[PDB]
């Protein structure tokens, strides 16, 4: 998220068009964007088109125009002279394609090759007029979109939601590198800056969970400190742990400590889960998802979140504000946790309704106890306090003495309402976490750990995921192309040292030059047995599953594989909310809004037309009179309800009297005749 936020181009701001005043001619993708602004990555809301991401290879020239590299061809010979061109020069010349048949001597195989003319036309020009060629494929895709495997099989519409749902993952407690990546993880991780990189070559002296000592080659020594459980701007942990031992030797630029979402220097936003593609009992109906319970017991998906609470003892004109322990008119039990100063001891579970700070300010005893309490809906241990004091000559805000600040942390497991989602854009909300015994399990007893619907794949045109699934399995089980008597034809161009892989072998398929379909068929045709001489996935890639709930085998084979799915930051615990009676506004007596204060839902404008259309009148009257702003109606209905009486009649709404006063303020003699 940070790396993509630094490379952003926004067309809205001081001196630029506005979100509500942009036509449909500025949000499109002009044919001059090729290689200068990714056409896939873009927000989905009303900003679509006004915000974009700079491509991988682009640079900004001194005047501020965006330039891209091109490899120049002289006399049909593809040299290596890289020339940076802006839009105009690219317009003037003719440019070929990156993935063209080079004959190993910088010469095209056939005279005709796709090119881009002046105005973005695509045509066939003989291989004698070509003036430039793309340095490589992928040149049009930004950093986020370059990390989607099999991108060229997915429609743009779903690749967009795939590139906008990698910036919303959540650093899990333990991270794991994906089985099938795209070779772009390493560079993104190292550049994003969340990992620690040895500044100079040397040998490790001592390693510990807090710091690492490197003894450079020439006397000097350096100590790298580590961020342990530090809050980020959006409430996720920021751990860092070493990956080197006390005797290893490091080199300049080497990765020496993981980050929030890194695993040995590679981006790791999620986990590899065993996935089947059958519809199951309707629980995964309409994009829903089903998880096994193994993803709860073993903390496969378990996030850590940290909340910050602040309070300032203002000097005030009256003076004497102090953070004291003794809370006026308080019980002994509720004051038990607080330390001598009046700050909760670090290591106590402050569930909703406890004290964190004891603050009393003059009434203008004559004081008000604004003792900061855990707001509604929080819990978890207290992992860190920080108190700044005026007496310690700190840089405090003018007119205060103390700024005690507390942190509370909690581990959230996966549960109903979360928003798991793959990479290609197969978002869903966990529907039912079944126990580990009734899950479709393969012939050898391994239970599948997730289930996806078939009806969602073909219609949305994101077939890519299925391909990934297949490849995932080939990565997990490990294969061995049998070159006993000549290499098979489908593996002729397969690179060396890829004819065979050990189990749990990681592979990479670049975005636009990857694994062809024939290669996938060949790999699936040969795969090692698991423990005994059994193969669980036949050539088509589909296995035979036993139904755990009833016992009988499913009549037809099903697709199974390994897919890399994440956990999005739209958890349920931050969304659920209810209100019986709580705070009310001041100018108008309606209830407030938002989960923080207490909040009550809004019965909007076009939710009073449905009630009118139904013909229900009493419900509408009570939803607008004795539930929102009739001052006596509220207390009377509360009393009637607790005492079992029949609910009373409504009066008139306060906002109407506010309207009458506002009209009268304009010199309009409004009067309520009879």
């Amino acid at each position: 998220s940070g790396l993509t936020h630094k490379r952003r181009l926004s067309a809205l701001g001081p001196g630029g068009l506005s979100r509500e005043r942009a036509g449909l001619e500025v949000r499109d993708v002009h044919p001059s964007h090729y290689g200068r602004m990714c056409p896939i990555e873009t927000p989905e809301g009303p900003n679509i088109g006004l915000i974009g991401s700079l491509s991988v290879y682009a640079r900004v020239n001194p005047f501020g125009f965006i330039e891209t590299p091109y490899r120049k061809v002289v006399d049909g010979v593809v040299s290596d002279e890289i020339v940076y061109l802006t839009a105009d020069e690219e317009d003037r010349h003719v440019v070929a394609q990156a993935n063209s048949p080079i004959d190993a001597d910088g010469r095209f195989v056939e005279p005709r090759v796709l090119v881009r003319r002046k105005a973005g036309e695509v045509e066939y020009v003989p291989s004698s007029e070509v003036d430039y060629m793309d340095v490589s494929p992928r040149q049009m895709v930004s950093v986020a979109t370059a990390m989607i495997p099999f991108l060229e099989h997915d429609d743009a519409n779903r690749a967009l939601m795939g590139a906008n749902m990698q910036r919303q993952a959540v650093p899990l407690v333990r991270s794991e590198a994906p089985l099938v990546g795209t070779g772009m993880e390493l560079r993104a991780a190292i550049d994003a800056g969340d990992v620690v990189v040895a500044e100079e070559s040397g040998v490790i002296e001592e390693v510990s969970a807090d710091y690492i000592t490197v003894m450079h080659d020439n006397g000097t020594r350096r100590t790298y400190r580590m961020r342990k459980f530090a809050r980020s701007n959006h409430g996720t942990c920021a751990n860092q742990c070493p990956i080197v031992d006390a005797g290893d030797r490091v080199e300049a630029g080497q990765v020496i400590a993981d980050g929030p979402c890194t695993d040995d220097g590679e981006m790791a936003l999620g986990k590899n889960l065993l996935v089947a593609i059958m519809p199951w009992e309707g629980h995964n109906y309409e994009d829903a998802i089903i998880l096994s319970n193994r993803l709860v017991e073993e903390d496969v998906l378990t996030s850590i979140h940290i909340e910050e609470h602040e309070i300032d003892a203002r000097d005030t004109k009256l003076g004497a504000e102090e953070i004291t322990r003794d809370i006026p008119n308080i019980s002994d039990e509720v004051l038990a946790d607080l330390d001598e100063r009046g700050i909760v001891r670090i290591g106590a579970e402050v569930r909703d309704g406890d004290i964190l700070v004891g603050k009393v300010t003059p009434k203008g005893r004559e004081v008000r106890d604004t003792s900061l309490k855990v707001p509604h809906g929080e819990s978890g241990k207290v992992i860190g306090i920080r108190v700044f004091s005026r007496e310690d000559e700190d840089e405090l805000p003018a007119g205060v003495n103390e700024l005690v600040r507390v942190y509370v942390a909690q581990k959230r497991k996966i549960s109903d309402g979360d928003k798991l989602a793959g990479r290609h854009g197969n978002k869903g909300v966990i529907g039912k976490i079944l126990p580990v015994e009734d899950m479709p399990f393969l012939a050898d007893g391994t239970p599948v750990d997730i289930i996806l619907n078939t009806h969602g794949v073909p219609r949305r045109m994101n077939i890519g995921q299925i391909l990934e699934t297949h490849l995932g399995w080939c990565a997990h089980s490990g294969w061995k192309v049998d070159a006993a008597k000549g290499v098979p034809d489908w593996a002729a161009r397969l690179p060396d040292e890829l004819l065979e892989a050990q189990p749990n072998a990681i592979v990479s398929t670049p975005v636009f030059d990857g694994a062809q379909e024939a290669e996938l068929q060949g790999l699936l045709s040969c795969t090692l047995p698991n423990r005994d001489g059994d193969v669980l996935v036949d050539a088509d890639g589909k296995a035979m599953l036993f139904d755990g709930r009833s016992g009988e085998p499913f009549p037809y084979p099903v697709t199974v594989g390994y897919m890399y799915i994440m956990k999005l930051h739209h958890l349920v615990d931050d969304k659920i909310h209810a209100r019986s009676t709580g705070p009310y506004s001041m100018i108008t007596q309606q209830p407030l809004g938002g989960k923080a204060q207490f909040g009550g839902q809004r019965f909007g404008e076009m939710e009073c037309w449905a009630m009118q259309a139904y013909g229900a009148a009493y419900t509408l009257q009570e939803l607008l009179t004795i539930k929102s702003d009739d001052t006596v109606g509220r207390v009377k209905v509360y009393e009637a309800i607790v005492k079992g009486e029949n609910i009373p009649e409504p009066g008139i709404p306060e906002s109407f009297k506010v309207l009458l006063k506002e009209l009268q303020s304009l010199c309009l003699n409004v009067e309520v005749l009879s």
């Binding site: 991988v56 890289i82 080199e251 080497q254 990765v255 690179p495 890829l498 670049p510």
Partner: peptide, 26 residues
């Protein structure tokens, strides 16, 4: 690749890219 201690991640790529990716925060 070129990072001294990166994990060995094999690739299916057929082409070769003459130019390394520039500094992503440059």
């Amino acid at each position: 690749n070129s990072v001294p201690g990166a994990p060995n991640r094999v690739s299916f790529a057929k082409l070769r890219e003459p130019l390394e990716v520039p500094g992503l925060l440059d």
